[PDB]
Structures are given as structure tokens and as C-alpha cells.
Amino acid sequence: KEYHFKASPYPGQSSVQRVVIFGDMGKAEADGSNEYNNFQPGSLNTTKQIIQDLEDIDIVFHIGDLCYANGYISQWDQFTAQIEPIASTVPYMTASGNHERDWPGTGSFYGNLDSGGECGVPAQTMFFVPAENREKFWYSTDYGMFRFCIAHTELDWRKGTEQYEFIEKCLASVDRQKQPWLIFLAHRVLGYSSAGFYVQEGSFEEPMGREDLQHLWQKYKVDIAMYGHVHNYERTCPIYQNVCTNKEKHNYKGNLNGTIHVVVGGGGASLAEFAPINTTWSIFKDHDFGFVKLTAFDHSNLLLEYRKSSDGQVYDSFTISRDYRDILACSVDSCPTTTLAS
Amino acid sequence: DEHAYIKATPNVLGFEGHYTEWVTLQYSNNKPSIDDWIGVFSPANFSASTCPGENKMTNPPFLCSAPIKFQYANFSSHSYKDTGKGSLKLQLINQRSDFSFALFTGGLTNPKLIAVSNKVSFVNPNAPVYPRLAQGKTWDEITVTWTSGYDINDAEPFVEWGPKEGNLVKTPAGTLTFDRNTMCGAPARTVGWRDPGYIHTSFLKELWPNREYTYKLGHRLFNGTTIWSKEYHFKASPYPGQSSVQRVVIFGDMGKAEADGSNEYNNFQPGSLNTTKQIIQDLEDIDIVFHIGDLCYANGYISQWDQFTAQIEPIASTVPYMTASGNHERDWPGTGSFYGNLDSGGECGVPAQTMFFVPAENREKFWYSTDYGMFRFCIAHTELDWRKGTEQYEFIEKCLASVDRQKQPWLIFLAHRVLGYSSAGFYVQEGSFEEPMGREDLQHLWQKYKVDIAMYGHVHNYERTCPIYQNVCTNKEKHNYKGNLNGTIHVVVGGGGASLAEFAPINTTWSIFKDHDFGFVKLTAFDHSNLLLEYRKSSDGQVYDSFTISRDYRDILACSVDSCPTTTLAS
Amino acid sequence: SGGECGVPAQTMFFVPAENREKFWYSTDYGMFRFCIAHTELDWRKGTEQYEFIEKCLASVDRQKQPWLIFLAHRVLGYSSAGFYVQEGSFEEPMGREDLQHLWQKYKVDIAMYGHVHNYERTCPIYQNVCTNKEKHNYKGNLNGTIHVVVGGGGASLAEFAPINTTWSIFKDHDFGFVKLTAFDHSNLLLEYRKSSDGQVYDSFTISRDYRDILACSVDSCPTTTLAS
Amino acid sequence: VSNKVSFVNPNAPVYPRLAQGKTWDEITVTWTSGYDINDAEPFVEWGPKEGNLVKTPAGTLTFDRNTMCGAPARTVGWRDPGYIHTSFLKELWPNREYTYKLGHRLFNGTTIWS
Numbered sequence A: 001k002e003y004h005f006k007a008s009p010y011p012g013q014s015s016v017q018r019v020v021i022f023g024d025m026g027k028a029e030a031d032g033s034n035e036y037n038n039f040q041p042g043s044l045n046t047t048k049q050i051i052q053d054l055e056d057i058d059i060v061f062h063i064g065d066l067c068y069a070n071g072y073i074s075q076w077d078q079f080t081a082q083i084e085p086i087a088s089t090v091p092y093m094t095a096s097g098n099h100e101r102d103w104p105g106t107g108s109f110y111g112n113l114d115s116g117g118e119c120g121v122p123a124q125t126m127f128f129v130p131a132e133n134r135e136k137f138w139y140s141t142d143y144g145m146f147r148f149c150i151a152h153t154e155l156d157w158r159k160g161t162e163q164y165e166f167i168e169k170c171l172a173s174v175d176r177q178k179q180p181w182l183i184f185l186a187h188r189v190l191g192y193s194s195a196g197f198y199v200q201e202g203s204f205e206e207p208m209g210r211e212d213l214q215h216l217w218q219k220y221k222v223d224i225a226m227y228g229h230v231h232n233y234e235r236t237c238p239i240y241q242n243v244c245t246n247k248e249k250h251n252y253k254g255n256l257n258g259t260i261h262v263v264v265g266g267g268g269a270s271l272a273e274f275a276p277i278n279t280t281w282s283i284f285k286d287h288d289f290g291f292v293k294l295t296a297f298d299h300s301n302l303l304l305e306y307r308k309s310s311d312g313q314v315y316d317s318f319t320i321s322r323d324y325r326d327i328l329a330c331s332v333d334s335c336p337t338t339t340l341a342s
Numbered sequence B: 001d002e003h004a005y006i007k008a009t010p011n012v013l014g015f016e017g018h019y020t021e022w023v024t025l026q027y028s029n030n031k032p033s034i035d036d037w038i039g040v041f042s043p044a045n046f047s048a049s050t051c052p053g054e055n056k057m058t059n060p061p062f063l064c065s066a067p068i069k070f071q072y073a074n075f076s077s078h079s080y081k082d083t084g085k086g087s088l089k090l091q092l093i094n095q096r097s098d099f100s101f102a103l104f105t106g107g108l109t110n111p112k113l114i115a116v117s118n119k120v121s122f123v124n125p126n127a128p129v130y131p132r133l134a135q136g137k138t139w140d141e142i143t144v145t146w147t148s149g150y151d152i153n154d155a156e157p158f159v160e161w162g163p164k165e166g167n168l169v170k171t172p173a174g175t176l177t178f179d180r181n182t183m184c185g186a187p188a189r190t191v192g193w194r195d196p197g198y199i200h201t202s203f204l205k206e207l208w209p210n211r212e213y214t215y216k217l218g219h220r221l222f223n224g225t226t227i228w229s230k231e232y233h234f235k236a237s238p239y240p241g242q243s244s245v246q247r248v249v250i251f252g253d254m255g256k257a258e259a260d261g262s263n264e265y266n267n268f269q270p271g272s273l274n275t276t277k278q279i280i281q282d283l284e285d286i287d288i289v290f291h292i293g294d295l296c297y298a299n300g301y302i303s304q305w306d307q308f309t310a311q312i313e314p315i316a317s318t319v320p321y322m323t324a325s326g327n328h329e330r331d332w333p334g335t336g337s338f339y340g341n342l343d344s345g346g347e348c349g350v351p352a353q354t355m356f357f358v359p360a361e362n363r364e365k366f367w368y369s370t371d372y373g374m375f376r377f378c379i380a381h382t383e384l385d386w387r388k389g390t391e392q393y394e395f396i397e398k399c400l401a402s403v404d405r406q407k408q409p410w411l412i413f414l415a416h417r418v419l420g421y422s423s424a425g426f427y428v429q430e431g432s433f434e435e436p437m438g439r440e441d442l443q444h445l446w447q448k449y450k451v452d453i454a455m456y457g458h459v460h461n462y463e464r465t466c467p468i469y470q471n472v473c474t475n476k477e478k479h480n481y482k483g484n485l486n487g488t489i490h491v492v493v494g495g496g497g498a499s500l501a502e503f504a505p506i507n508t509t510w511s512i513f514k515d516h517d518f519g520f521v522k523l524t525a526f527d528h529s530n531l532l533l534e535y536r537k538s539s540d541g542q543v544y545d546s547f548t549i550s551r552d553y554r555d556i557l558a559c560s561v562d563s564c565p566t567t568t569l570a571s
Numbered sequence C: 001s002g003g004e005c006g007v008p009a010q011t012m013f014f015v016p017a018e019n020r021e022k023f024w025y026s027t028d029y030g031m032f033r034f035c036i037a038h039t040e041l042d043w044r045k046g047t048e049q050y051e052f053i054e055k056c057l058a059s060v061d062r063q064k065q066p067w068l069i070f071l072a073h074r075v076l077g078y079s080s081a082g083f084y085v086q087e088g089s090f091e092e093p094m095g096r097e098d099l100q101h102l103w104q105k106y107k108v109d110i111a112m113y114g115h116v117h118n119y120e121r122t123c124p125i126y127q128n129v130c131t132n133k134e135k136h137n138y139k140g141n142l143n144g145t146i147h148v149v150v151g152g153g154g155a156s157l158a159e160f161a162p163i164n165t166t167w168s169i170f171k172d173h174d175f176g177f178v179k180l181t182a183f184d185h186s187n188l189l190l191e192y193r194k195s196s197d198g199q200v201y202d203s204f205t206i207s208r209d210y211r212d213i214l215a216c217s218v219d220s221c222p223t224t225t226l227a228s
Numbered sequence D: 001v002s003n004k005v006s007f008v009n010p011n012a013p014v015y016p017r018l019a020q021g022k023t024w025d026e027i028t029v030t031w032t033s034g035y036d037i038n039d040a041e042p043f044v045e046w047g048p049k050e051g052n053l054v055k056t057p058a059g060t061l062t063f064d065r066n067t068m069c070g071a072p073a074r075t076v077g078w079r080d081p082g083y084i085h086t087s088f089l090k091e092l093w094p095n096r097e098y099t100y101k102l103g104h105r106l107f108n109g110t111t112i113w114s
């Protein structure tokens, strides 16, 4: 049958541009049947809310933990069918997570059994992303005023690695006058999360998540970094080195001096509990299913909305209102070299 | 008691698709003074409120709405001071919106508004205008960038193009713009602001080398009507490495000036029209132009960017017009520019990186490589750090390394500020014959990769060095260079138009020729073994300095000091 | 060297260099630390010598030894000597560009040169630009290194170029030498004396405390954490 | 010494050689002729086997005696190579069968074909 799409903007184009991001949606049988790995009770709701709002969604990023087939391969087809009403009309951009890739003794950085023996093969074949090497699954992509830099948290990301080199190149190549909104995406939490499972191992991130990469996020002024993996929603203050760099909760203005980190792993898979710690930097939490929409109105105004999958309504939000000169201004560990000469 | 008037004729300009028109103004003041003046305003609804200066780049007249241009009431009506009657003929370019004219008393420093004219406008203020060509990402792609008043919701922009008298096709354009709050400081963000319209770029791909093409700019309005420009034309560039006679013009610092003699902000480029004129006259024998920074000197009086695109249009609409970024494009304190000068007047690179296209990976960084047949050019951005360890230095090394010198023998390095050698008084007064740190890291690369000629703007004069490395001449010839020269020749060619710069009273060991005048360089590659440089004055287009290089591939491959690859002893 | 190739110099005299052929070394005198370079070997970033210089400048405890002095024969800093200016330079080619990173990062107070047979003193300076406008009585963080040509010890005098730069505070086309007097940890005096009479013809003082050495300057500002 | 002998057209396009191009769906055709760019415009006409054909341009390169670094190449062994042309056949369908011909459009208007 006939399908249709609207071509993306020219990079840097001034138009209203809408992006949906979440992780960990998975799948489920709309006929109520049971199936292997049937632990994504929010899956159909999230899919439903995106389809309902599709007229006002331009592109989707599903940031790892795609279908949770975990080796019951039949479910990849199931997932492509489930998302077809979305993915057949707007780009459906993927990242790789632990349930896509992890298997011990396969060169994955995490040795978990989480892929159920898939070792990335279905994910890197069923879906296309414009990675130089689809096995590595890191890539850059644009949507008008937005630049996205997608990491693969099941390969090493630390300084000295191939991946880190890629990330730095991606963050450095964007012209921020034309493309102000710089977004970093990854499956596992490389930034900040109050997930119970992290806190129990004495961390608010994957071990080694942020320490090397925050140099790049700060140097290149990443506006928002978003993660899946933790099955809930959490938003931080603009932050660097565990310290809030701006005290606003909603109306961000000018140079924020740090990146905002957002966990949006509530796409469908069984909810994850938060630790009983309310940190200095954790502005909002939601133990429920939901997703984020970013709306770039113009080159100076961005909106983030968190929407629940149960009703599609907005439960958290913020705006960034700032000009090119605020991106160019120095921040801590974000201040280019100078000459004294004239 | 002035009972003044001012009136403009005609009030509809640019019939038959014309985008320039002469207007006659006539005016009167019952109490005339020699310091009375007329301002041209676009939009026509201007504020004559005073907005006092706030930095050295906000200049008189201090009006909240900066005029487009201005002229004294007595300019051509020399009895004005006695009669209180005058007239002016002004040549207006179409740059969207409409125009008003205003008469003032009190001079540029203490103006008082005494009369405003009727409004005048082009028939189509939004018409597609001032295309400029630039080489694209590959040898067989050329880009067409133009300005209109049509946003993407008003009309779908495109270019219709193909081989001369052959089949034509439509190709899309990307549309970009910028707004007042994109400007980093005053005057650009304040008194100098003017809406730039919409800047469209089309990519004309799969070119046949050397083939003649035609193109037209179009906008398909959503009511179904298409608005078209006149036809333009160009000849596609050679295949890289092609043997044919290839001619390249290079200069910096040309700026802009008013052909009708009018004053305007930053009106300190008295050679500008002469350089533009000489290039236009010789255009049949010019294949590509490089304007290496200090483009129009708008410096935040934004209206002048359209002026500049119009000024160069007879050149840039037919040959690629490749730009580099200089201090007057980019410098602004606290903006990540390596130089913290106020020289951009708050633009912080935005107009330069939007009005013009270059095939840079990151248009904000403004460094890039491009080819023209036997030439390879590597263009640096001297308003960002260039030293070893920087992103820019890594780029430069990659550019110099990627060229196959058998096929493309002529390797040219271009930069705005002087990274090489200059005897400019201003450098020598700070104890230098370069920008501080200009050459020390980069000469490693120039020498290792045998850059033939390195050229700079920024200093408003011409100067040529011997082939040189580490401040020492490596070849003693003045004009007829043969074989392996063992060093790079450096040339200051910043005499394109901006007010001349004096030389220091030192004649160095390495300075072969100096000209304190306006002019430009033409490089002619006759074949793979023979290159000519000519320096021409802008006043007459004649040659006042020149040299030739005659050498073969084996000369490029031969070792020089700090340019000798590793070997094995094995066989 | 007339064929000596360093042999007499490196045998007739002892210095506490690890390798006497290389002739670069560090030495102390109370509140002073001296780092002595060898300008007849490469000094640029990446060289063995540059690595030594950085190690020397880094190892000094500036509370205890506030006065950090860099010494070299050829002019690696700034000189208005006619012979330099005729080759389009106010230094040896490549003299300062890599090393000023180190002078500035480690807050070298005074850098001194021979080779040019005259005396000349600059403002506190970095990247060809004066960082402090005082001519004699320096207080606090000067934000740059003071450079001094003191090659007027005896050899035939060298003429200055007919340029007076922005940074050249004092020049003497005559024979003479410098004496540095450290009175205490906060007060240093430089005197230029002519050899003909032993009298003082130029001088300055630096009065500053440890906290001034520790304060950030341009290209001299250590990393921080936001954490507490 | 004998009488002279010649091919009817010594300048004819000859000896094409294919090489993979810069992407998986590009192939290059390189050939030799005696027609410089001022003598004729070179091209390749190509398309799917028994399908529609299109013309694509060629870049033209050569070298001369003084390009050679030493003897015999620069001396007794030198022989003029004519002109070497390369076309880029893009947007290929994988596994599909194609045909091509080498062409030179003389500026008198006649085209010489392989």
C-alpha cells in the first residue's frame, strides 16, 4: 500500500519542530495474549499516545530497550508492526541498550545476559541508523534547529575510546547559531538518576558514567542529556560535577552553566523504584509510564514537556529562553583560549 | 520656522524586474546651514529619537533607527547654504521593505529632524536578489545563495538550472535567516539592526567540468504563482588536477562604498569601488575569487550586508566568490573568538556565516578546503585559535596532507590576519612582524607540506617576501623561481579597499616588494609546471609586481629543510 | 664557537646539570629559584629541554621561594636589537611562543637574557601585550613576566633598531649588569648598574605576597571543582 | 626502415578499466584516448542492460615528460600517454546488469563512440 512522509527541515531552519523521546517501551499483545518477556505493561499506552498526537510529532527517538524480545526473535516483527503507524510516517530513530546488545564474551562493555543471545544482531539489522559502523550504533543526526548525538552505552564511552572521540566530533561539528538545541542521548544513565538499583551500589549513574563525558557536555554546552534504562522519569537542575549551576525550576534564561539531565526510561517496561534519597539536584520524579516532547519554537525558545502514557497530558515541563551569545559566553570548563593581542 | 520639505521621485522603483533605481530628492529649509543633511531610511517608518553611543563601534549619527546612507544637503547643490534649496540623485538598491527620506539640521553629531518625505518602494520589495556562487562539498557541486523577502511559509524557494540552451530542472533551497537577538552586541543588536529577509542556498550537483550553465532563482508562492529572477550563468569548475589555464583573484579588506557618492556608517574603504571595477573589467579572464576576510565592514550596521552582496553581484553571480572570516566579521569580547576586539560591532560572525556559503563542515568555524583545477586552497579562520593542539591546526594539517601534488601542484594557504610576515607599522610597534604566535606552529605545516604561497589580508597594503622559513630566505631570486624553493612565499594582499596601512620604517632581509596603495593578486596556472603571480593596482588594473614559479613534480617531492620524509635502509 | 663545540665550557666550569653537555639546570639561592636554559639546543614544546624547564618551574614552593627567575643566553623573550628587527623579529625566531606558556602558567617573575650587547627592560608582558602599566613600583599580581636583556657585560655594544615598542620601558647602549636583592619574602629589587661607575641607572621593585602568586592570571588559572 | 602504418582513428577511446568508487553504489570507468578537453568533451553513456541510457561526464588527466622524475621514464623511455578519462557511474542498483559506452563529442559536433 501507499505510505507518506514529510521531508525534514534544512538544518538550521526556523520552523516549529517537535521531537518525542523515551526509552524502554517494549511490546505487548493488544489481544491480551501472553508471550515471552511480557513485562511491558505501559507499551500500548505509550504507542497509543504517540499515534494520537502524531500530527504534532516530527521525529521520534527510542533510546534503547526496544522490544525486549531477548532472544525470542519472533517479537522483532511484532515490534515493527506495533510501531508502524508511527515509524512508517515519521523517522523512528533508535539507540542500542542492554536488552539489544549485552552478552558475555562478545566485546560488549557490560557482560550481562540481557540480550538473550541476540548480541545486537536483530537491532542492528531490523533498524537503520546513519552510523558509520552499525555494529557500534553511535551516530549523529539533525532535525532543523536540533542536533542529536547518540551514544551506545553497551560499548566503552570513556576518554581514549573510539566512542568518546566520536562524541567529541559530533558535539564540535554543530554550528550553534543555526542549530542551537544540542541534545545528547544514551540508553544507560551516564548522567544522574536516583534509581534504587544505582543507589544500592553506591552510585547515582552507571559506574564511570559522567566523569569523562561531562568534560565534553560542558565544553560544548550540551543543553539536555537524556537517558532510558531506569523505568521512570526524573529531571535534574542544570548541573556540572554534581552541583547545580542554576536555581530555576521552570523558566531557564540565558547561559545556564550546566547541562540538564533527564531520565525518560518510562516508555513501557515494569517501573523502577527510586531510592529513599532526595538529592540536591533532583527537581522532579515520576514513578509511572511516560515520555518527553521537545518543542523548538524558534532559535531562542525551547520547551520540554513530560507526558504520562496513561492520558497523554503534561505533568512536568521547562523552557529555555536564550540567544546565540549565551551559548558563546564562557561557563566553568567551557571557555575558549584567547590572545591578548589586537 | 524652518518650514522645511523633502520629496522623492519616482515613488515606484524597479519596473521590468530592475533591482537598482535612481531617485531624485528635492528639499528646502527656510533656515539653512552647511551642516544640514539627508538620511535614507528603510523601513520608511524610522525613529529619529537619539540613542546615545555605547561603545566605539556605535557612531554618529546617533539615531535609534540607523539610516541606510546619508549625504550633506550641499553635496551637489553648492548654493544650498545661501538658498536653502537643493537636490540629490541617489541610487537605491532593492533590499526589501520601503524607504523614507529625512532632512536634518545640526550635523551628524546633533541632528534635529525638520522634514520627512513621501514613501518610495520597489514594485516587488521581496524579489530574489544578489545571487552569489560558491564551490560546494565536491568538485562537481556549486552552490547558489541569494536573498529574498519570502519565508518558507510564503513561498517554496528553488533554482531552475541546466546546461546553456539545454534541459532545465528545479532543485530545492535551504532557507536560513537571523534575528536581532542573534546579534551579540551593539550596534548590531540595537541601532544597526535591519531585518535581513531570508537567505536561500541551492546545491547544483553532478556538474560536467568546464560546461556552460544557466540558472534562475524562483519562489513558488502558495497562491500558485511563481516569482522568477532574470537568468544568470556560470562555467563549471575544472576536474581537480585538470590541465587548462586557470586564473584566481585574491585580496582582503575590500569593504563597500556608495557609487552615488553618499556617506554611510563605516565609510572607510575608498579603494573598494576601484577594486570591484577592475575585477569586473577583467572578469572574462578570472575564474574564481577569494576575498580573505574583512568583507563589507558593516560592523553591525546590518543594512550594508545587502549593499555588499549587490556590489559584488556582477562578479559573484557568475564566478565563485569564496570568503574567509576576519576580525570585522567575527571578533567580539566574551564570544569564544580568539581575539576579543569589538571589531564586528556585535555581529559575532552571524551575518558573514549566513549571507555567504563556504563548504566548511561547521560554518561557524569558517575554515575549509577547496579546489580549482591545479590549485588546492586551505582557508583558515584567524579569529579562532590556530596553534598546535587546536581543532583548527588539525584541520589545516589534514587539508595540506590530502592533496595529490602531481595532479594539483599549486598549494595555497589563505588567512585573514597575518600569520606569516608583514612590515606593517602596527605590528612592528608591538614588537612583531606578524600576529603574535602567527607563524611558529603553522610553519611546521607550511614547510612539511610545501605550501607554495601563503596569503593574508588585514594589513591594508601589499607586501611580498622571499621564499622563507624561520625568518630566513631560502632562495635569493626576486622574480624567476625555478625548482625546489625550500620555503613558502608569503604575500600580504590586504589592499582591497579599506584605508591604507603604513609600513614601519624597517626594510627587512625578507621583504622583496611593498606597495602602499590599493590592489589585488591574480594567480595564473598555465600548466602543471608554470605558475604566475601578478600584483595589480586597483586604480588602473596594471601589473606592478610579479613572479613566476617553474618547477616539476620531482621538485615538490625533493627534500627541503624540515620537509624530508622517513626512509628505510632496506631494498 | 671556533670549533670548541662546547667542550671547554662544559669542562672548565661545573654546573649541577644532569647532563653537562646539555647545560640546562636548576639551582636555588634562599628565596630565589633559577631555571637556566641552553639556547644552543632546541627549547620548543616536545623537546627534552622544554620538559626540563616545565619540571623546574613546577617544583618550586613559591611560599618559601617566591622569586622565580628564568635565565637563557639568546633572547627568547623580547629585544629591540637592530639585528633581530632586520630579520623581522624582536627575539630569536621561535623564542617565546612555546615557552611563554610555561612562563605564564608558573608565574616566572623575571626572565633574563644575554647575547644582545646592551640593556633593555620590558613591562610585565604576555603575548606581546603589557599586563601592567607601572614603570617602577610593581605591586601585587603583575599578570605577566618581566623580561630583561643584560648582555652588556663586556662584548662590543649592539645597536638598537629605530623602533620604540609599546613594551620597551628602558634601554641602555652601554656596558652594565643587574643586581637582584631579595629583602624578604614580599619585596624584591632589581638594579641595573653601569660597568663604568657601578652606579644605578634603572631599577624597579616588586612588592607582593604569596596570595598574589596564587591568584589567577590570564593563562595561569588552575582547574577547580564545583563540589565542596 | 618501412612505410608508415596507422590505425584509422589513432585517437579512439580504448581499454576501459573499472574500479569501485567512493561508495558501494558507485563504479568508475577509466579509459584512454587521444582527445584532450579542447578537442572533444568526454563522457560515458550507460544504463541498465536494455533499459534507458544517460550520459555522465568524465574528468580528464594526463602527464608529461617532465612529470617523470628520472631516466628512462624522463628520457629514452618517454612516450606521450594521451588523455586519461574517468567517469563516475552513480546510484547503482546492487547486482543489476549494466551496459556502457565511451564517448567523445568533437567540437565539430560529431561524436566518436566505443
Ligand SMILES: *[C@@H]1O[C@H](CO)[C@@H](O[C@@H]2O[C@H](CO)[C@@H](O)[C@H](O)[C@H]2NC(C)=O)[C@H](O[C@@H]2O[C@@H](C)[C@@H](O)[C@@H](O)[C@@H]2O)[C@H]1NC(C)=O
Residues within 6 Å of the ligand: A276, A277, A278
Ligand atoms: C522525597 O520527595 C518527596 C517530596 O515531595 C516526598 O514524597 C512526598 O512527600 C509528601 C510530604 O512528605 C507527601 O504529601 C507526598 O504524597 C509524597 N509522595 C509523593 C510526592 O509521591 C518524599 O517523602 C517520602 O515519601 C513518602 C513515603 C512520604 O510520605 C514520606 O513519608 C517520605 O519521607 C521525600 N523523601 C524523603 C526521604 O525525604
Ligand SMILES: *[C@@H]1O[C@H](CO)[C@@H](O[C@@H]2O[C@H](CO)[C@@H](O)[C@H](O)[C@H]2NC(C)=O)[C@H](O[C@@H]2O[C@@H](C)[C@@H](O)[C@@H](O)[C@@H]2O)[C@H]1NC(C)=O
Residues within 6 Å of the ligand: B123, B124, B221, B223, B224, B225, B227
Ligand atoms: C499571488 O500573489 C501575488 C502577490 O500578491 C499576486 O501578484 C500581485 O498581483 C497584483 C494584481 O493582481 C499586483 O498588484 C501585485 O503587484 C502583484 N505582485 C507581484 C509580486 O507580482 C498574484 O497575482 C497574479 O499576478 C498579478 C500581477 C496579476 O497578473 C494577477 O492577475 C495574477 O493573479 C497572485 N496569484 C494568484 C493566482 O492569485
Ligand SMILES: *[C@@H]1O[C@H](CO)[C@@H](O[C@@H]2O[C@H](CO)[C@@H](O)[C@H](O)[C@H]2NC(C)=O)[C@H](O)[C@H]1NC(C)=O
Residues within 6 Å of the ligand: A041, A042, A045, A289, A309, A310, A311
Ligand atoms: C493505560 O492507560 C489507561 C487509560 O488511561 C489507564 O487506565 C486508567 O487508569 C486509571 C487508574 O487505574 C483509572 O482511573 C481508569 O479507570 C483506567 N482505565 C480506563 C480509563 O480505561 C491504565 O492504567 C494505563 N496502563 C498502565 C499500565 O499504566
Ligand SMILES: *[C@@H]1O[C@H](CO)[C@@H](O[C@@H]2O[C@H](CO)[C@@H](O)[C@H](O)[C@H]2NC(C)=O)[C@H](O)[C@H]1NC(C)=O
Residues within 6 Å of the ligand: B034, B035, B036, B072, B074, B075, B078, B081
Ligand atoms: C558643505 O557642507 C560641508 C559639510 O557640513 C561643509 O564642510 C565643513 O566646512 C566647515 C567650514 O569650512 C569645516 O569646518 C568642516 O570641517 C567641514 N565639515 C565637513 C564634514 O567636511 C562645507 O563647507 C559646505 N560647503 C558649502 C559650499 O556649503
Ligand SMILES: *[C@@H]1O[C@H](CO)[C@@H](O[C@@H]2O[C@H](CO)[C@@H](O)[C@H](O)[C@H]2NC(C)=O)[C@H](O)[C@H]1NC(C)=O
Residues within 6 Å of the ligand: B270, B271, B274, B518, B538, B539, B540
Ligand atoms: C580609483 O581609481 C581612479 C582612476 O584611476 C583614481 O583616480 C585617478 O587618480 C590618478 C592618480 O593615480 C589621477 O592621475 C587621475 O587623474 C585620477 N582620475 C582618473 C579618472 O583618471 C583614484 O585615485 C582611485 N581611488 C583611490 C582611492 O585610489
Ligand SMILES: *[C@@H]1O[C@H](CO)[C@@H](O[C@@H]2O[C@H](CO)[C@@H](O)[C@H](O)[C@H]2NC(C)=O)[C@H](O)[C@H]1NC(C)=O
Residues within 6 Å of the ligand: C175, C195, C196, C197
Ligand atoms: C671603563 O670605565 C672607565 C672609568 O669610569 C671609563 O673611563 C672613563 O670614561 C668616562 C666617560 O664616561 C670619562 O669621563 C672618564 O674620563 C674616563 N676615565 C676615568 C679614569 O674616569 C671607561 O670609558 C670604561 N670603559 C668602557 C669601554 O666603557
Ligand SMILES: *[C@@H]1O[C@H](CO)[C@@H](O[C@@H]2O[C@H](CO)[C@@H](O)[C@H](O)[C@H]2NC(C)=O)[C@H](O)[C@H]1NC(C)=O
Residues within 6 Å of the ligand: D008, D009, D106, D108, D109, D110, D112
Ligand atoms: C568532424 O571531424 C571528424 C574527424 O576529422 C570527421 O570524421 C572524419 O571524416 C573524414 C572525412 O572527411 C574521414 O576521412 C575520417 O576518417 C573521419 N574520422 C573519424 C575519426 O571519424 C567528421 O566527419 C567531422 N564532422 C563534421 C560534422 O564535420
Ligand SMILES: *[C@@H]1O[C@H](CO)[C@@H](O)[C@H](O)[C@H]1NC(C)=O
Residues within 6 Å of the ligand: B505, B506, B507
Ligand atoms: C626601504 O627601501 C626603499 C627602496 O629602496 C626606500 O625607498 C626606503 O627609504 C627604505 N627605508 C629604509 C628605512 O631604509
Ligand SMILES: *[C@@H]1O[C@H](CO)[C@@H](O)[C@H](O)[C@H]1NC(C)=O
Residues within 6 Å of the ligand: B483, B484, B485, B486, B559, B560, B561
Ligand atoms: C634546497 O635544500 C637542500 C637542503 O635540504 C639543499 O641541499 C638543496 O641543494 C637546495 N635546493 C635548492 C634548489 O636550493
Ligand SMILES: *[C@@H]1O[C@H](CO)[C@@H](O)[C@H](O)[C@H]1NC(C)=O
Residues within 6 Å of the ligand: C162, C163, C164
Ligand atoms: C625612542 O625613545 C627615546 C626616548 O624618548 C628617544 O631618544 C628616541 O629618539 C626614540 N626613537 C624613536 C624612533 O622614536
Ligand SMILES: *[C@@H]1O[C@H](CO)[C@@H](O)[C@H](O)[C@H]1NC(C)=O
Residues within 6 Å of the ligand: C140, C141, C142, C143, C216, C217, C218
Ligand atoms: C590581573 O588579571 C585578572 C584577569 O585574570 C584581572 O581580572 C585582575 O584584576 C588583574 N589583577 C591585577 C592586579 O592587575
Ligand SMILES: [Fe+3]
Residues within 6 Å of the ligand: A024, A065, A229, A230, A231, A269
Ligand atoms: Fe529497560
Ligand SMILES: [Fe+3]
Residues within 6 Å of the ligand: B253, B294, B458, B459, B460, B494, B498
Ligand atoms: Fe581590514
Ligand SMILES: [Mn+2]
Residues within 6 Å of the ligand: A065, A097, A098, A099, A187, A228, A229, A230
Ligand atoms: Mn536497559
Ligand SMILES: [Mn+2]
Residues within 6 Å of the ligand: B293, B294, B326, B327, B328, B416, B417, B457, B458, B459
Ligand atoms: Mn582585519
Ligand SMILES: [Mn+2]
Residues within 6 Å of the ligand: C073, C074, C114, C115, C116
Ligand atoms: Mn651570544
